[PDB]
């Protein structure tokens, strides 16, 4: 913005490096859908998610194992059914 900070112990330059820009081009997505939905929630029903991100492209299949990866990574968290919440 007006100013810039850390991403953190983690960044971009990290998964481009082995990584096509793809990677962040749905990494970036998935977390921005999940956050823009936990925004007012306790989390982001993947239901919305499975909505908005099957209108920007995502397949079901990749939403749900995307969707996986996160939770398992710890990019996200689950803490309800079918519903998930950007870390």
């Not at 971009?12 to 859908?33: F, L, N, Q, Y």
């Not at 909505?51 to 969707?67: D, F, M, P, R, T």
Request: glycine share 6%.
């Amino acid at each position: 913005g007006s100013h810039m900070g850390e991403s953190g112990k983690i960044d971009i330059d990290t998964i481009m490096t082995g990584k096509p820009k793809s990677a962040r081009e749905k990494m970036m997505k998935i977390i921005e859908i999940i956050d823009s939905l936990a925004v007012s929630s306790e989390c982001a029903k993947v239901k919305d998610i499975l909505k908005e991100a099957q209108q920007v492209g995502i397949e079901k299949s990749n939403i749900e194992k995307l969707l996986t990866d996160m939770r398992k990574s710890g990019i996200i968290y689950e803490a309800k059914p079918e519903c998930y919440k950007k870390v």
